[PDB]
Amino acid sequence: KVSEQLKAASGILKEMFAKCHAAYAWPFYKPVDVEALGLHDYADIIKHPMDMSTIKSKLEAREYRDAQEFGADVRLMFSNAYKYNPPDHEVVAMARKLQDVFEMRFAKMPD
Amino acid sequence: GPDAMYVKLISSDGHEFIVKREHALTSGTIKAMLSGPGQFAENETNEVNFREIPSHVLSKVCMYFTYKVRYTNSSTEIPEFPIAPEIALELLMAANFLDC
Amino acid sequence: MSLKPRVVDFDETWNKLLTTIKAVVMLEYVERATWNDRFSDIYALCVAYPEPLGERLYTETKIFLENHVRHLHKRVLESEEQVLVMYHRYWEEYSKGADYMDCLYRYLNTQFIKKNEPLMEIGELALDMWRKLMVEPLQAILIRMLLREIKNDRGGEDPNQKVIHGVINSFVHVEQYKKKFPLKFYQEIFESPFLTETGEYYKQEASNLLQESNCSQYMEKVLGRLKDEEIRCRKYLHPSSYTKVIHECQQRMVADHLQFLHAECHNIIRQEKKNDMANMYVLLRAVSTGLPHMIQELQNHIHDEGLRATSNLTQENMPTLFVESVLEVHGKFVQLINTVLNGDQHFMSALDKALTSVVNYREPVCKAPELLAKYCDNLLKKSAKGMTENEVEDRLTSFITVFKYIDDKDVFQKFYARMLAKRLIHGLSMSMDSEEAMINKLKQACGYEFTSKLHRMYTDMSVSADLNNKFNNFIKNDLGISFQIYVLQAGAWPLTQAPSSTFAIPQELEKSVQMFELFYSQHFSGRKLTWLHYLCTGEVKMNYLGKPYVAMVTTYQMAVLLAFNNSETVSYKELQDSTQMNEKELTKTIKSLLDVKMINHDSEKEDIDAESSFSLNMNFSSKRTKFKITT
Amino acid sequence: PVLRSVNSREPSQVIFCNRSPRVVLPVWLNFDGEPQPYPTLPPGTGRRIHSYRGHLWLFRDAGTHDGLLVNQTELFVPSLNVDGQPIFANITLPVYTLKERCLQVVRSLVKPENYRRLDIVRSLYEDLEDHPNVQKDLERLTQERIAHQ
Amino acid sequence: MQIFVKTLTGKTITLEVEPSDTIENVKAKIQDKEGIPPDQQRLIFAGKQLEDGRTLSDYNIQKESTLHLVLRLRG
Amino acid sequence: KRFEVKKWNAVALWAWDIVVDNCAICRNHIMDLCIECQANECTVAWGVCNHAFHFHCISRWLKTRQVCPLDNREWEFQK
Amino acid sequence: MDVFLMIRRHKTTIFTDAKESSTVFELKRIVEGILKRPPDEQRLYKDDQLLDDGKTLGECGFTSQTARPQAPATVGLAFRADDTFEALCIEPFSSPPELPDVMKP
Ligand SMILES: Cc1ncsc1-c1ccc(CNC(=O)[C@@H]2C[C@@H](O)CN2C(=O)[C@@H](NC(=O)COCCOCCOCCNC(=O)C[C@@H]2N=C(c3ccc(Cl)cc3)c3c(sc(C)c3C)-n3c(C)nnc32)C(C)(C)C)cc1
Ligand SMILES: [Zn+2]
Numbered sequence A: 001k002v003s004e005q006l007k008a009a010s011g012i013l014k015e016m017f018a019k020c021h022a023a024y025a026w027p028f029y030k031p032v033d034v035e036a037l038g039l040h041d042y043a044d045i046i047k048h049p050m051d052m053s054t055i056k057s058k059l060e061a062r063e064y065r066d067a068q069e070f071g072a073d074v075r076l077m078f079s080n081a082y083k084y085n086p087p088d089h090e091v092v093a094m095a096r097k098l099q100d101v102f103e104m105r106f107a108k109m110p111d
Numbered sequence B: 001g002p003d004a005m006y007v008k009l010i011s012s013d014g015h016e017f018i019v020k021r022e023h024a025l026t027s028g029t030i031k032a033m034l035s036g037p038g039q040f041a042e043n044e045t046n047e048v049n050f051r052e053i054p055s056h057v058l059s060k061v062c063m064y065f066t067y068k069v070r071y072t073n074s075s076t077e078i079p080e081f082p083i084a085p086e087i088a089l090e091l092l093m094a095a096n097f098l099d100c
Numbered sequence C: 001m002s003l004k005p006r007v008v009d010f011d012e013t014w015n016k017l018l019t020t021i022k023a024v025v026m027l028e029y030v031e032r033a034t035w036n037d038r039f040s041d042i043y044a045l046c047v048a049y050p051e052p053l054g055e056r057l058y059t060e061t062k063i064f065l066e067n068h069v070r071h072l073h074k075r076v077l078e079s080e081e082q083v084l085v086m087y088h089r090y091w092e093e094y095s096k097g098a099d100y101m102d103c104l105y106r107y108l109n110t111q112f113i114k115k116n117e118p119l120m121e122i123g124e125l126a127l128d129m130w131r132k133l134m135v136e137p138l139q140a141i142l143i144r145m146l147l148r149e150i151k152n153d154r155g156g157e158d159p160n161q162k163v164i165h166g167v168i169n170s171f172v173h174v175e176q177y178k179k180k181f182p183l184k185f186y187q188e189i190f191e192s193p194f195l196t197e198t199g200e201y202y203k204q205e206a207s208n209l210l211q212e213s214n215c216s217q218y219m220e221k222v223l224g225r226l227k228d229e230e231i232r233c234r235k236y237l238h239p240s241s242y243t244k245v246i247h248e249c250q251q252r253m254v255a256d257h258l259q260f261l262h263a264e265c266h267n268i269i270r271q272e273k274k275n276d277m278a279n280m281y282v283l284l285r286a287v288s289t290g291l292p293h294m295i296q297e298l299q300n301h302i303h304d305e306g307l308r309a310t311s312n313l314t315q316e317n318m319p320t321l322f323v324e325s326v327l328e329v330h331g332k333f334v335q336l337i338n339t340v341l342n343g344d345q346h347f348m349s350a351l352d353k354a355l356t357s358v359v360n361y362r363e364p365v366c367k368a369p370e371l372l373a374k375y376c377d378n379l380l381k382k383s384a385k386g387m388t389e390n391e392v393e394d395r396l397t398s399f400i401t402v403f404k405y406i407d408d409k410d411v412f413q414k415f416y417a418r419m420l421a422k423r424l425i426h427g428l429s430m431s432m433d434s435e436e437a438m439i440n441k442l443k444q445a446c447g448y449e450f451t452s453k454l455h456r457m458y459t460d461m462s463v464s465a466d467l468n469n470k471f472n473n474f475i476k477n478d479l480g481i482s483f484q485i486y487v488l489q490a491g492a493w494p495l496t497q498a499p500s501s502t503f504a505i506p507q508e509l510e511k512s513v514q515m516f517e518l519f520y521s522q523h524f525s526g527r528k529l530t531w532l533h534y535l536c537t538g539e540v541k542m543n544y545l546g547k548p549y550v551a552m553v554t555t556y557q558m559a560v561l562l563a564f565n566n567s568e569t570v571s572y573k574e575l576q577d578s579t580q581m582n583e584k585e586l587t588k589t590i591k592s593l594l595d596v597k598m599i600n601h602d603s604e605k606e607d608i609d610a611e612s613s614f615s616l617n618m619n620f621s622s623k624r625t626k627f628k629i630t631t
Numbered sequence D: 001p002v003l004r005s006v007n008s009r010e011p012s013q014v015i016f017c018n019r020s021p022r023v024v025l026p027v028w029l030n031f032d033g034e035p036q037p038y039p040t041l042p043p044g045t046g047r048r049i050h051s052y053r054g055h056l057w058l059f060r061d062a063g064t065h066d067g068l069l070v071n072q073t074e075l076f077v078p079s080l081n082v083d084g085q086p087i088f089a090n091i092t093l094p095v096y097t098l099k100e101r102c103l104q105v106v107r108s109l110v111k112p113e114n115y116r117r118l119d120i121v122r123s124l125y126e127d128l129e130d131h132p133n134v135q136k137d138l139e140r141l142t143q144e145r146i147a148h149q
Numbered sequence E: 001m002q003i004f005v006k007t008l009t010g011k012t013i014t015l016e017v018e019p020s021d022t023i024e025n026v027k028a029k030i031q032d033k034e035g036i037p038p039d040q041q042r043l044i045f046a047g048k049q050l051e052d053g054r055t056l057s058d059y060n061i062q063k064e065s066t067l068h069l070v071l072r073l074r075g
Numbered sequence F: 001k002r003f004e005v006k007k008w009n010a011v012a013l014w015a016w017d018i019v020v021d022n023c024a025i026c027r028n029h030i031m032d033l034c035i036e037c038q039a040n041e042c043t044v045a046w047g048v049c050n051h052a053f054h055f056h057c058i059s060r061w062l063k064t065r066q067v068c069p070l071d072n073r074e075w076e077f078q079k
Numbered sequence G: 001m002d003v004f005l006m007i008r009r010h011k012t013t014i015f016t017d018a019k020e021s022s023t024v025f026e027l028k029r030i031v032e033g034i035l036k037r038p039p040d041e042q043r044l045y046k047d048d049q050l051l052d053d054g055k056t057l058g059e060c061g062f063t064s065q066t067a068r069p070q071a072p073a074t075v076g077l078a079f080r081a082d083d084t085f086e087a088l089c090i091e092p093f094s095s096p097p098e099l100p101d102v103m104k105p
């Protein structure tokens, strides 16, 4: 099964790394750069960040075994933004859209 | 090779400065002096007498001409132009008079 | 001895400066030292510590300029009809001095003037004062004497160029007025009267010339006058009114005499008029719409000449006259237009439109496709007395020029296909490579979807050799007949697939066919062969006389002659039962044998019926042993 | 107004590089034309910045409010990045005239309530009073752009 | 009655389609006269896509008209 | 026999089972050379369905994909 | 790159530019073009040391970092009269006035 779930997770990740989801998915491509973005309390408040580039780089290594680790990583990545930002925000709206996409494609999870 | 395209400028105290004409035409007043009734001809020497500008100001003005000609339209870094603090007022007067 | 503000006495410095200013305005001699010195003196008055004096200097300079200008417009008014020479002499000095004065008032312009009747800079004030001088005398008197001199230039003698050009250029110097009208004073003061006078003069001259001349001599004179006007405008006017003057002259002359050239345009076209067409075109191109009528008469001339040269006769026996006539007409008039009218694709389009109607005539079915196809075929035959290898392509290169003008490409394709089949199935083509060149030309002229079922025929006629070689090589794996077969592609060749009647294959030729389908099925799968028995030819050496009679006949003749082998006399019923062909086909082949006198009917019945019995002629004789039927 | 910023909402990455011997202060033009200031840059430094396409930046001096040159021009409008690369931003001293250089030195050395005790000409008194202003520069650029079109 | 359709390779062919038949029927006729399944088909008439679930009479198709056949498209 | 036959010639038309078409890749007839060939013997390839294709065309494309350009189903290359 | 100098004799100052690879017989030629003295009698002096003929400026000790346009160097000049050289002598410039009270730090 390992092959099946790993292939499905890679497919979902690459579909979220698509060419016309860029309307609401470009922030998460690379690590958050507080120095070049102008943030002070981000590092203190959010202890653990996560992102697509690190996910993929770890994927090409023997580090990801079960799809639940990937699911927890995705949930952590969205919860970080939900925690840091106020309720009404552009990043909140775009993260909610991407979360609905992930929820659909994870209800479509072949297992 | 050697030429006579160099103007000669004379200070009030009796100093002679020999500067290239293209460098000198930066000043509007010098251009006005050299362009009109009083133009040179034959075996004459290109001279302009400044009876109201001492030597330590005219040398600064000549160095400014050289600096401006050298560091114009250059992609390299342009250093600051130094001015001693005890000549600032005289330099300001001479710059206002010479239109530069 | 410093650049510090002071307290200064104006009048001494004002006098010392006013002495030099007059020597600068009039271009006098001033030493170098004073020129350099006065710059310090102006600065001294411009930065005087109590109540700086710049407004007073401006006011005192304005009075000097106004006095100088008012005095100049005394000594120029008192001139007694020699105004122009004094004006130019007093203008050159004032201009070269007003240019130099501005360079000496630089500090006042930079500091005081450019920080705020609006005040004007010195060089802008002097030109305004001269404009005031140019208000009263310049307009009436000097515009009159300027128009008179240019009128006197039209013949007579040549007045001085420098004075006139300088006075004309003077009005342009409103230069420091760069706002939506740098050249408005010039126009309003000089250009409109000049245009009106030019119009009146050229109208009257055109009327006078038309009164005492014909249409042939009119054009050369008009061209000469136009060239003179063009070469004289550059000598006097500012480079912004050449087009207006030339346009007004052309409009006046030609438009006023328009319905007089459209009368001779018809006559010049019909005759040669080599030197008149160019003169008419060069002066009718630039005036409104005069070309269309010439277009129409050229088209009519082409149509009339083409019909008179083609539709008259063609000797009723020779189709090579059509192409030669059309080509000669086209080449002659293309050369004429290129040599005289210098392109002008309107006339080329008219020529094409007229040749299209010439070639595609239809008396109240057009014969153009038939003649074109027959020309191609007779040119491509083997040889009667025809041309050589590098002449057929030479003529066919120009043939396509005639070819493009036909409107029915389909009929030409049909006729060419039929005649190409006829030429190919008989091996009578002059050179096998020529068809490839003709196909390439037709493809380059029409398109790829137009010559496909000619290129496929070429390829088949090329591949048949290899297929025959292959079958003859792989046969030996005893027939008695030399077998050469053409394999053809159905759906492209114009051959009727449906047989006319049921035909029984000759018994002696029953193994060859079966071996052929066996081989073809073995080495070519998916193909359904069909046999057309009315294209095959056979050879027979008869062995019932004392001479080696050898004949070439068709398949139906083969079968009918073979039928007699059992007995010398056979009835119609026996032949009908054995061959199972229709009555019409058997009748035709029996008649063909009767015409060559191979057989004779037993009874006197000239027609053919159920009881028709025939027996071969006993004593047929022929001078030539080898022969072909109705050769 | 005319000169302002457009909410393109598309990311862009830039590198502010300083090659002048003075301190630099960037100012960003808002969506209504009211400029806003941003932290300063030490001489000879390169700082990575995140911005949007179609925004307006102008570079000034920290304390003297003098103007400097970016990419050998006055303004800087970022463009979308290609090949995943950042776009450099050179900062260079303009070649001042002698009058302006002397005015700067005098302004630095003299208190702004001690001008009319200098032994100079009358006009230089108001010339020294005419301080550089970002508002004045923006106004001038506005009619410059208007006349260009 | 009879209309005309153009293929992808350059030829043109004709069909006898009444103004009462559905566009699906036209697609099936094209498929059997050609080698293109109906899923990969698209019809152009006056620069307008023809919906599968309709008929000719709704689109006001007159006599002897011509239609362009193009493959399936997506954004 | 009364006579002997020496030579014979014949002609014969033919057609495919059910096919007529143009190559959909390079838009040249099935019985014609390729554009790649024209720059200078290649045969004609067929399919399980009724598509007459072109040997060089179909090979150069089957280097990447499999199915028919008109049938995105499969490829046979047998007959 | 390029070095800048100030050739000086008595009250006359000559402004020129030169490359580090040039020798003394390129300054001598310019002095000839402007002053027109004996061609082989211009002993060029730096500080208190004589410079030879073929030896370049870089060997003499000229660098482009310390001979900028804002501050060129100085090379003395000596002509020969009556077949004997005159002792080097350069006259200094003027002196600035006293700094005013208002500008004092
Ligand atoms: C070091 C330095 N050197 C001399 S000055 C300087 C410096 C210069 C600029 C900056 C930051 N740049 C700006 O503030 C830009 C420059 C100019 O284009 C105006 N500007 C703006 O951001 C303006 N426009 C907007 O902000 C657009 O409106 C969006 C709502 O405002 C968001 C305010 O927060 C900006 C900083 N980011 C955050 O607080 C969180 C961060 N935002 C985002 C983010 C925010 C909005 C969107 Cl649509 C997408 C992503 C973010 C990420 S990761 C990432 C790469 C980004 C850009 N992110 C994620 C995931 N979760 N949170 C984030 C403004 C003036 C209204 C603040 C920092 C330092
Ligand atoms: Zn092909």
Ligand SMILES: [Zn+2]
Pocket (backbone or CB within 6 Å): F033, F034, F036, F037, F042, F055, F056
């Ligand atoms: Zn091929």
Ligand SMILES: [Zn+2]
Pocket (backbone or CB within 6 Å): E035, F047, F049, F050, F051, F068, F070, F071
């Ligand atoms: Zn298929």
